[PDB]
Design a protein around this nucleic acid. Structure first.
Length: 47
DNA sequence: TGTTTTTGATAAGA
DNA sequence: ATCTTATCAAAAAC
């Protein structure tokens, strides 16, 4: 199968950053993954 | 060349 | 312009 873009570690962190107000576009770029992926891992309707 | 799993563009959104 | 969501083709792995 294909590996995940972010490990469970990165998920807790990104989750945090997102709650702290970091723009998904910025996080995408930095972690080198796609904005759509972030919206999947963390629905807007969940922050 | 083949399956699986997850990625990421993308279109649509009373 | 923005933001979000689910879809779906295919990249990534083996």
């Amino acid at each position: 199968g294909r590996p995940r873009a972010i490990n469970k570690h990165e998920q807790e962190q990104i989750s945090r950053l997102l709650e702290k107000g970091h723009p998904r576009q910025q996080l995408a770029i930095i972690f080198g993954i796609g904005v759509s992926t972030l919206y999947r891992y963390f629905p807007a309707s969940s922050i």
